[PDB]
């Protein structure tokens, strides 16, 4: 009987391809296959995901070229990834992470082929500039439900699964399909790579910002500072006096003096200080 602690370690490559494909495919419930591997009874390793040329209808999608897929499989065996199918994924742009009826049927087929297949869902609409809305799934056996058996033995505390979503519950979560825990593992190369991605070049690292633009920038910032000081003086002219405590934040829903003052003073700190430092450092380092 399957275990609760089952994990799916998805390669960063796989995640990026999934998300890019789905974001391209919005709103179409675009679909793709992935090659991974079943290392053991507690883990599934997902390596790569490649899409499907099919472009069906604005409510549904369909497999077009089994020949396409078989050829991709053979060739990737030749070079690329000698993995072989472990599941499939499709975007649900703005629905959560639940499986429609057709989704469940496709799965049923996948499991019939390989009892431990996996389905995957991604929400490029919802996946934020930060956390990413994704999940994995495997069906629930109606035979087990009728017999009273249970999906997985939870020989762990890895069954919290971060508060299964109400939407997934509604659409059928844990009554026909159950979530699984995703993870990201890096063999240090992609890891330090990821680190490199944002890192910028010493070109700029030493490139002092032009100084005429900087002088004008300071001029503008000091002007807006003067005005913010005026309105701040007016605001403090009463502040607690005349007791806006009941007014609280609702004293005015606009134009807080202090917050703007601190924001702009901080930014002009940054600008002026670092530019002066770069000036000093260059003057002295190029000799």
């Amino acid at each position: 009987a399957v275990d609760t602690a089952e994990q799916v370690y998805i390669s960063s490559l796989a995640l990026l391809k999934m998300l890019k494909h789905g974001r391209a495919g919005v709103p179409m419930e675009v679909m793709g296959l992935m090659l991974g591997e079943f290392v053991d009874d507690y883990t599934v390793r997902v390596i790569d995901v490649f899409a499907m040329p099919q472009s069906g209808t604005g409510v549904s999608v369909e497999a077009v070229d089994p020949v396409f897929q078989a050829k991709m499989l053979d060739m990737l065996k030749q070079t690329g990834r000698p993995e072989m199918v472990v599941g499939w994924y499709h975007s649900h742009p703005g629905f959560g992470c639940w499986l429609s009826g057709v989704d469940i049927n496709t799965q049923q087929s996948f499991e019939a082929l390989s009892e431990r297949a996996v389905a995957v869902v991604v929400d490029p609409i919802q996946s934020v500039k930060g956390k990413v809305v994704i999940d994995a799934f495997r069906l629930i056996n109606a035979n087990m439900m009728v017999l009273g058996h249970e999906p997985r033995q939870t020989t762990s505390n890895l069954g919290h699964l971060n508060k299964p979503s109400i939407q997934a519950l509604i659409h059928g979560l844990n009554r026909h399909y159950y979530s699984i825990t995703i993870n990201y593992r890096k063999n240090e190369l992609e890891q330090k790579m990821l680190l490199n991605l944002h890192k910028k070049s010493w070109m700029e690292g030493l490139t002092l910002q032009d100084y005429s633009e900087h002088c004008k920038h300071n001029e503008s910032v000091v002007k807006e500072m003067l005005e913010l000081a005026k309105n701040y003086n007016k605001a403090v002219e009463e502040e607690d006096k005349m007791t806006p405590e009941q007014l609280a934040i609702k004293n005015v829903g606009k134009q807080d003096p202090k917050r703007h003052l601190e924001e702009h003073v901080d930014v002009l700190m940054t600008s002026n200080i670092v530019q002066c430092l770069a000036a000093m450092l260059d003057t002295v380092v190029f000799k």
């Binding site: 602690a5 020989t155 762990s156 505390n157 890895l158």
Partner: protein, 104 residues
């Protein structure tokens, strides 16, 4: 530590058997056996009695060589005024104590 490491495997939680520390004091004699002698706590037998299963109150309690003696309920524990067996080691120390015996 191992017990606390059960998140990822329940079967490990049994390890607290190791940490189980018998909260007892045994008076052992040279014959390497329990002598039928009693211990006394100069304290209320109400603050350190077994939990209720689901004289107003004296300040004395008595016990036998197999003696459930809690840490706080160990310092006050004492051997009665006189007995065949006397604590060769200070009883407030706790643990297993050897008992020097009188004539017989």
């Amino acid at each position: 530590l191992v017990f606390t490491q059960f998140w990822f495997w329940f079967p490990l939680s049994h390890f607290l058997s190791l940490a189980y520390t018998p909260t007892c004091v045994i008076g052992l004699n040279k014959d390497l056996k329990m002598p039928k002698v009693q211990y006394k706590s100069n304290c209320k037998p109400s603050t350190f009695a077994y939990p209720a299963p689901l004289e107003p109150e004296p300040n004395f309690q008595l016990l036998d060589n197999p003696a459930r003696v809690m840490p706080a309920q160990l310092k006050v524990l004492t051997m009665p005024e006189t007995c065949r067996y006397q604590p060769f080691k200070p009883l407030s120390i706790g643990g297993i104590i050897i008992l020097k015996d009188t004539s017989e």
